[PDB]
């Protein structure tokens, strides 16, 4: 009754203190520091490969760490592993549930995880002693669809869900070591820091949170957007990240100063971002949109410079290689281009 | 370079064997129709599954493989996981036409399914599911549809209506008022790319999977006629 309103008044005053601590450390905006640097140019990438074997819309892809093999998931229940140099498909893994909303590729290359509307995160063993691709585990503790999954070892995948819960698992025994709570709505994508000591998570409540992986506790919360956050990615030096929401705007948050630095919005783009990823230098910010075409944002001036094209439907997945060579973008027309 | 040529050879020999099976899967996957079946908690979709986070129910009428799947595992918010279903033939939307207190909730859900960027090309098969409970409730008289819908006092049974022989002129007016509510939400925005096919169903209808066959056949025939610049 009265204690709830009292604690809510204290929480409001404390949020005002947080806001005043964030507006005091606002010396000058990133656009003012970057007014003296040269523009990026006009990045004109061309489709160096078109990978076509999927029956239905491609919902997620992930690059191997060798920057050559990639895995892609489509809603026909197929998880195909391509050789992006020769455009041969190494494996074609027939899933159990068609509705696969994500996939990952073990940072060593041994295992592959997927998992969608069946609330579990299946994990597949690629290099088996018999040569067959079988299911290694099925992590089945989530209550709601599974909207991302990022390997952290050969044993320690972390997983986002459609029940506001990220859950760090333990693939050996098969049960979640930690559970990260604090989001209000569906949590849509996560992105491990390059050292994997912490990660960020974007949710359908217009907010992102920074999770310590060891302590299992929300470190910081970033809320500057206006609608669902569909895509998130870390800056290559792990000290910043970019959210892409459905209010048709990408933003660059920084974990240190704890604010928003850039806003990647224009007055003609009224379609929402479905994917983001940086370039190996952290200057180009790829961003897949609903108007069926990616962009390439100069991520220090906010000026567009470059536009990708050539997809029939919305661009769902988008990921730069680990060495910075290519940029593979899948889309709901079941074709996976590769740019350069 | 013999080892490298053997690498490329045994890689092509595997891509060929994979694309063979994948063409087989393409043949199978296209002779099968997917049908997102969604309703409400009390609607009665569980009883139209007449066979985890999804209850797939395969059935086959007239040698065509239908593949219907209720989605129960997820929580109440459905704005993100429903985009997964923009490639289904139909969307079977089942509603109980008896509980008037929760009929505007179904009207709003239908209006949000209809006017959605990704479901804007999917046609809905509308099942009005508890016709016998509706007959009972409206023949009793304690429940008045004009308390929840003030424009039921100025409604007149359609002329093209087909009142089943043996029923009251009150049950028919009640049925068709709700059917016309959904149909007017339909036609107010649907520009020929998707349609709504309303039906009246009980819980004992044994000919309820033929009515999905006849409506999917029509959905797809209109799709073909419309892509041949022929409608």
């Amino acid at each position, epitope marked *: 009754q009265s204690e709830l309103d009292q604690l809510r008044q204290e929480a409001e005053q404390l949020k005002n203190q947080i806001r005043d601590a964030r507006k005091a450390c606002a010396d000058a905006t990133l656009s003012q520091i970057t007014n003296n640097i040269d523009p990026v140019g006009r990045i004109q990438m061309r489709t160096r490969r078109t990978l076509r074997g999927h029956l239905a819309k491609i919902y997620a892809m992930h690059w191997g760490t060798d920057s050559r093999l990639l895995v892609s998931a489509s809603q026909d229940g197929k998880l195909i592993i391509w050789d992006s140099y020769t455009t041969n498909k190494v494996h074609a893994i027939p899933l159990r549930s068609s509705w696969v909303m994500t996939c990952a590729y073990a940072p060593s290359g041994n295992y592959v995880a997927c998992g969608g509307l069946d609330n579990i995160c299946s994990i597949y063993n690629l290099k088996t002693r018999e040569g067959n691709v079988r299911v290694s585990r099925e992590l089945a503790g989530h209550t709601g669809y599974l909207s991302c999954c990022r390997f952290l070892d050969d044993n320690q995948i972390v997983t986002s869900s459609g029940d506001t819960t990220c859950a760090l698992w333990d693939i050996e025994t098969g049960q979640q070591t930690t559970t990260f709570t604090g989001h209000t709505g569906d949590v849509m994508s996560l992105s491990l820091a390059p050292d994997t000591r912490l990660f960020v998570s974007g949710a359908c*409540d217009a907010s992102a949170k920074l999770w310590d992986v060891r302590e299992g506790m929300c470190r910081q919360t970033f809320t500057g957007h206006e609608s669902d956050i569909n895509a998130i990615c870390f800056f290559p030096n792990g000290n910043a990240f970019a959210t892409g929401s459905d209010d048709a705007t990408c933003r660059l948050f920084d974990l240190r100063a704890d604010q928003e630095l850039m806003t990647y919005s224009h007055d003609n783009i009224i379609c929402g971002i479905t994917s983001v990823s940086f370039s190996k230098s952290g200057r180009l910010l790829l961003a897949g949109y609903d108007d069926f075409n990616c962009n390439v944002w100069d991520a220090l001036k906010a000026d567009r410079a470059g536009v990708l094209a050539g997809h029939d439907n919305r661009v769902s997945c988008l990921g730069v290689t680990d060495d910075g060579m290519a940029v593979a973008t899948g889309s709901w027309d079941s074709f996976l281009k590769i740019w350069n | 370079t013999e080892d490298q040529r053997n690498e490329e050879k045994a890689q092509r020999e595997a891509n060929k064997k994979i694309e063979k099976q994948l063409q087989k899967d393409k043949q199978v996957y296209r002779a099968t129709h997917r049908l997102l079946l969604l309703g409400a908690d009390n609607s009665g979709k569980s009883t139209i599954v007449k066979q985890s986070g999804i209850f797939e129910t395969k059935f086959q009428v007239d040698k065509v493989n239908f593949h219907m799947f209720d989605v129960g595992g997820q929580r109440d918010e459905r704005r993100k996981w429903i985009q997964c279903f923009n490639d289904v033939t139909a969307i079977i939307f089942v509603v109980d036409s008896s509980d008037y207190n929760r009929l505007q909730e179904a009207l709003n859900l239908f209006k*949000s399914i209809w006017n959605n960027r990704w479901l804007r090309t999917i046609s809905v098969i509308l099942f009005l599911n508890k016709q016998d409970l509706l007959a009972e409730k409206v023949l009793a008289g304690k429940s008045k549809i004009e308390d929840y819908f003030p424009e039921f006092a100025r409604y007149t049974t359609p002329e093209d209506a087909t009142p089943e022989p043996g029923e009251d002129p009150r049950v028919t007016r009640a049925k068709y008022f709700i059917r016309d509510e959904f149909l007017r939400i339909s036609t107010a925005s649907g520009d020929g790319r998707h349609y709504c096919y309303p039906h009246f169903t009980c819980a004992v209808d044994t000919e309820n999977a033929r009515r999905i066959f006849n409506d999917c056949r029509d959905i797809i025939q209109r799709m073909h006629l419309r892509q041949y610049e022929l409608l």
Partner: nanobody
Amino acid sequence: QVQLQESGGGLVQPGGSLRLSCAASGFTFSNYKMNWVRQAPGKGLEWVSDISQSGASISYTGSVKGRFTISRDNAKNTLYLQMNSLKPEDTAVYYCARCPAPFTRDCFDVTSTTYAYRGQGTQVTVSS
């Protein structure tokens, strides 16, 4: 941060009038189709009345038709609901929802039990 704080009224007699105001802030008001949902004591969430981006396509729930008048003021980032001829069936808390995405005609999952873009609510108790 997206916030929508309502400021309505308290106790009225059956047949009374009351005007709920919902100062929306933290986001561009003009791009979203606002709403009004209510929760009657001992019941679930139900939708009362919406309004499009401009104030052109109004809609109502049956029970609220003729009595309530939803009107937005895009200049001051606020949403109004005028209530006339209040009945005891209208006792509830009135949340001022808004819609998930902008520039959309579908307002999806707006009466969900835990929904993100929605006010704390104001209690409109009509009695004697």
